Structure 1
Amino acid sequence: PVATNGERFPWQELRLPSVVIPLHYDLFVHPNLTSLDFVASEKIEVLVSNATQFIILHSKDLEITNATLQSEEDSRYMKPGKELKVLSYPAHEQIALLVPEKLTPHLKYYVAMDFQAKLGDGFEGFYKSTYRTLGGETRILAVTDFEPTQARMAFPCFDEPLFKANFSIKIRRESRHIALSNMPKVKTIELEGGLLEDHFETTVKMSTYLVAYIVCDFHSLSGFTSSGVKVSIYASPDKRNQTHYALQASLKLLDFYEKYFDIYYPLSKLDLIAIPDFAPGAMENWGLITYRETSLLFDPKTSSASDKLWVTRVIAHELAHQWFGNLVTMEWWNDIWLKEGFAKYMELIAVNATYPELQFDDYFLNVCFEVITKDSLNSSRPISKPAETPTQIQEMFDEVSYNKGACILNMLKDFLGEEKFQKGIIQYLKKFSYRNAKNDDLWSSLSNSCGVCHSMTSNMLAFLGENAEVKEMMTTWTLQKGIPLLVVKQDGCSLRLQQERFLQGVFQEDPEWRALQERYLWHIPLTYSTSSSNVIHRHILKSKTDTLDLPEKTSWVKFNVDSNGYYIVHYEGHGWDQLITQLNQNHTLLRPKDRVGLIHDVFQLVGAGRLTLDKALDMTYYLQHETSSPALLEGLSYLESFYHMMDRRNISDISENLKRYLLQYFKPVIDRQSWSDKGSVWDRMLRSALLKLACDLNHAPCIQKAAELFSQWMESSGKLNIPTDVLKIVYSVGAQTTAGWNYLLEQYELSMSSAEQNKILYALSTSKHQEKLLKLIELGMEGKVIKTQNLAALLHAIARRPKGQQLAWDFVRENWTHLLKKFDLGSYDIRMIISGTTAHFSSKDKLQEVKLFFESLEAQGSHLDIFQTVLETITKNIKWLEKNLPTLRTWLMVNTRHH
Structure 2
Amino acid sequence: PGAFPVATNGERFPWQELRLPSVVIPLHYDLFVHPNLTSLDFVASEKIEVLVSNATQFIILHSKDLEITNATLQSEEDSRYMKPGKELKVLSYPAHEQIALLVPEKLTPHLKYYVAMDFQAKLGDGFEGFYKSTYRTLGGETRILAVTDFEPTQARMAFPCFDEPLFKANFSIKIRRESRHIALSNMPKVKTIELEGGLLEDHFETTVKMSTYLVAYIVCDFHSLSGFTSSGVKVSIYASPDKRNQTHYALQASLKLLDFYEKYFDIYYPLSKLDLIAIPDFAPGAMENWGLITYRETSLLFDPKTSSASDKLWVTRVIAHELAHQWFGNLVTMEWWNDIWLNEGFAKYMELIAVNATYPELQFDDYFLNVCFEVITKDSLNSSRPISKPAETPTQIQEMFDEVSYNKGACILNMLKDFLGEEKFQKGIIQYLKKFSYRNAKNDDLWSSLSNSCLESDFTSGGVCHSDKMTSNMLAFLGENAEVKEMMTTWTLQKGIPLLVVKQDGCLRLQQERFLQGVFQEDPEWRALQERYLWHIPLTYSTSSSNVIHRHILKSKTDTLDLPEKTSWVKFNVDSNGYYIVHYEGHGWDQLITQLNQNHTLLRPKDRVGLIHDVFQLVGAGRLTLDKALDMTYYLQHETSSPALLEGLSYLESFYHMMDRRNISDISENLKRYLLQYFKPVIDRQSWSDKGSVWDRMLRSALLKLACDLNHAPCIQKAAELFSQWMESSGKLNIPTDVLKIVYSVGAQTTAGWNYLLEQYELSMSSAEQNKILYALSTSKHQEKLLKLIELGMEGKVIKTQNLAALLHAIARRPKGQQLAWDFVRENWTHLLKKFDLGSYDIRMIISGTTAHFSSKDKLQEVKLFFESLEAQGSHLDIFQTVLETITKNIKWLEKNLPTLRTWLMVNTRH
TM range (shorter): over 0.9
2:478 aligned with 1:464: yes
2:450 aligned with 1:435: no
Q: Secondary structure at the match of 1:123?
A: coil
Q: Residues of 1 paired with 2:359 and 2:702: CA distance?
A: 23
Q: Residues of 1 paired with 2:307 and 2:227: CA distance?
A: 23
Deviation at 1:244, TM superposition (A): 0.4
Q: Secondary structure at the match of 1:535?
A: coil
Q: Residues of 1 paired with 2:368 and 2:217: CA distance?
A: 34
Q: Residues of 1 paired with 2:496 and 2:763: CA distance?
A: 47
Deviation at 1:452, TM superposition (A): 2.0
Q: Residues of 1 paired with 2:656 and 2:158: CA distance?
A: 50
Q: Secondary structure at the match of 2:387?
A: coil
Q: Secondary structure at the match of 1:830?
A: helix
Deviation at 1:175, TM superposition (A): 1.1
Conserved? CA contact 2:321–2:350, under 8 Å: yes
Q: 2:496 aligns with which of 460, 464, 482?
A: 482
Deviation at 1:73, TM superposition (A): 0.2
Deviation at 1:443, TM superposition (A): 0.1
Q: Secondary structure at the match of 1:886?
A: helix
Q: Secondary structure at the match of 2:617?
A: helix
Q: Residues of 2 paired with 1:122 and 1:543: CA distance?
A: 51
Give CA-to-partner distance per residue, 1:222-253, whole Å, 9 cap, x none: 00000000000000000001010000000000
Deviation at 1:321, TM superposition (A): 0.3
Q: Secondary structure at the match of 2:666?
A: helix
Deviation at 1:150, TM superposition (A): 0.2
Conserved? CA contact 2:6–2:93, under 8 Å: yes
Q: Residues of 2 paired with 1:81 and 1:480: CA distance?
A: 53
Deviation at 1:883, TM superposition (A): 0.5
Deviation at 1:674, TM superposition (A): 0.2
Structural mapping, 1:124-523, within 5 Å: 124-450=128-454, 451-455=463-467, 456-493=470-507, 495-523=508-536
Q: Residues of 1 paired with 2:108 and 2:120: CA distance?
A: 30
Q: Residues of 1 paired with 2:194 and 2:465: CA distance?
A: 56
Give CA-to-partner distance per residue, 1:360-401, whole Å, 9 cap, x none: 000000000000010100000001100000000000000000
Q: Residues of 2 paired with 1:707 and 1:646: CA distance?
A: 26
Structural mapping, 1:728-739, within 5 Å: 728-739=741-752
Deviates more, 1:4-13 or 1:228-237: 4-13
Q: Residues of 1 paired with 2:233 and 2:858: CA distance?
A: 59
The count of aligned residue pairs is 897
Structural mapping, 1:755-774, within 5 Å: 755-774=768-787
Q: Residues of 1 paired with 2:7 and 2:435: CA distance?
A: 44
Deviation at 1:123, TM superposition (A): 0.4
Conserved? CA contact 2:660–2:815, under 8 Å: yes
Q: Residues of 1 paired with 2:245 and 2:509: CA distance?
A: 60
Q: Secondary structure at the match of 2:108?
A: coil
Give CA-to-partner distance per residue, 1:676-723, whole Å, 9 cap, x none: 111111111111111001001111100010000000000111111100
Q: CA RMSD in A?
A: 0.5
Q: Residues of 1 paired with 2:564 and 2:284: CA distance?
A: 52
Q: Residues of 1 paired with 2:41 and 2:697: CA distance?
A: 47
Deviation at 1:654, TM superposition (A): 0.4
Q: Residues of 1 paired with 2:22 and 2:868: CA distance?
A: 39
Q: Secondary structure at the match of 2:473?
A: coil
Deviation at 1:454, TM superposition (A): 1.2
Deviation at 1:81, TM superposition (A): 2.1
Give CA-to-partner distance per residue, 1:24-81, whole Å, 9 cap, x none: 0000000000010100000000000100011101000000000000000000001012
Give CA-to-partner distance per residue, 1:193-249, whole Å, 9 cap, x none: 000110000000000000000000100000000000000000000000101000000
Conserved? CA contact 2:501–2:582, under 8 Å: yes
Conserved? CA contact 2:279–2:295, under 8 Å: yes
Deviation at 1:766, TM superposition (A): 0.4
Q: Residues of 2 paired with 1:238 and 1:543: CA distance?
A: 62
Give CA-to-partner distance per residue, 1:707-742, whole Å, 9 cap, x none: 000000001111111000000000000000100000
Q: Residues of 2 paired with 1:156 and 1:109: CA distance?
A: 16
User: 2:544: which partner in 1?
Assistant: 531
Q: Residues of 1 paired with 2:375 and 2:30: CA distance?
A: 43
Q: Residues of 1 paired with 2:541 and 2:349: CA distance?
A: 24
TM-score under structure 1 normalisation?
Answer: 1.00
Deviation at 1:354, TM superposition (A): 0.3
Give CA-to-partner distance per residue, 1:402-428, whole Å, 9 cap, x none: 000000000000000000000000000
Give CA-to-partner distance per residue, 1:434-481, whole Å, 9 cap, x none: 000000000000000100221112210001110001100010011000
Q: Residues of 2 paired with 1:27 and 1:835: CA distance?
A: 41
Q: Secondary structure at the match of 1:95?
A: strand
Deviation at 1:267, TM superposition (A): 0.2
Give CA-to-partner distance per residue, 1:108-136, whole Å, 9 cap, x none: 00000000000000100000000000000
Deviation at 1:5, TM superposition (A): 2.1
Deviation at 1:320, TM superposition (A): 0.3
Q: Secondary structure at the match of 1:57?
A: strand
Q: Secondary structure at the match of 2:12?
A: coil
Give CA-to-partner distance per residue, 1:547-566, whole Å, 9 cap, x none: 00011011000000000000
Give CA-to-partner distance per residue, 1:555-590, whole Å, 9 cap, x none: 000000000000000000111100000010000001
Q: Secondary structure at the match of 2:11?
A: coil
Conserved? CA contact 2:282–2:802, under 8 Å: yes
Deviation at 1:869, TM superposition (A): 0.2
TM-score under structure 2 normalisation?
Answer: 0.98
Conserved? CA contact 2:337–2:397, under 8 Å: yes
Q: Residues of 2 paired with 1:6 and 1:650: CA distance?
A: 61
Q: Secondary structure at the match of 2:384?
A: coil
Q: Residues of 2 paired with 1:92 and 1:859: CA distance?
A: 22
Runs of 4+ in 1 over 4 A off after TM superposition: none
Conserved? CA contact 2:34–2:177, under 8 Å: yes
Deviation at 1:812, TM superposition (A): 0.3
Deviation at 1:12, TM superposition (A): 1.3
Q: Residues of 1 paired with 2:395 and 2:98: CA distance?
A: 16
Q: Residues of 2 paired with 1:452 and 1:73: CA distance?
A: 49
Deviation at 1:431, TM superposition (A): 0.3
Q: Secondary structure at the match of 2:47?
A: strand
Deviation at 1:492, TM superposition (A): 1.6
Deviation at 1:859, TM superposition (A): 2.2
2:797 aligned with 1:793: no
Conserved? CA contact 2:165–2:211, under 8 Å: yes
2:96 aligned with 1:92: yes
Q: Residues of 2 paired with 1:573 and 1:459: CA distance?
A: 41
Deviation at 1:2, TM superposition (A): 2.0
Unaligned runs of 5+ in 1: none
Q: Residues of 2 paired with 1:367 and 1:175: CA distance?
A: 46
Give CA-to-partner distance per residue, 1:807-836, whole Å, 9 cap, x none: 000000000010000000010000000000
Q: Secondary structure at the match of 2:762?
A: helix
Q: Residues of 1 paired with 2:487 and 2:766: CA distance?
A: 47
Conserved? CA contact 2:225–2:244, under 8 Å: yes
Conserved? CA contact 2:31–2:46, under 8 Å: yes
Q: Residues of 2 paired with 1:547 and 1:743: CA distance?
A: 66
Give CA-to-partner distance per residue, 1:608-653, whole Å, 9 cap, x none: 0000000000000000000110000000000000000000011000
Q: Residues of 1 paired with 2:24 and 2:584: CA distance?
A: 59
Q: Secondary structure at the match of 1:460?
A: helix
Conserved? CA contact 2:75–2:85, under 8 Å: no
Q: Residues of 1 paired with 2:564 and 2:134: CA distance?
A: 68
Deviation at 1:158, TM superposition (A): 0.3
Q: Residues of 1 paired with 2:105 and 2:265: CA distance?
A: 48
Q: Residues of 2 paired with 1:784 and 1:344: CA distance?
A: 34
2:86 aligned with 1:72: no
Q: Residues of 2 paired with 1:551 and 1:677: CA distance?
A: 51
Q: Residues of 1 paired with 2:569 and 2:632: CA distance?
A: 16
Q: Residues of 1 paired with 2:212 and 2:7: CA distance?
A: 27
Q: Residues of 1 paired with 2:301 and 2:210: CA distance?
A: 28
Conserved? CA contact 2:328–2:347, under 8 Å: yes
Q: Secondary structure at the match of 1:708?
A: helix
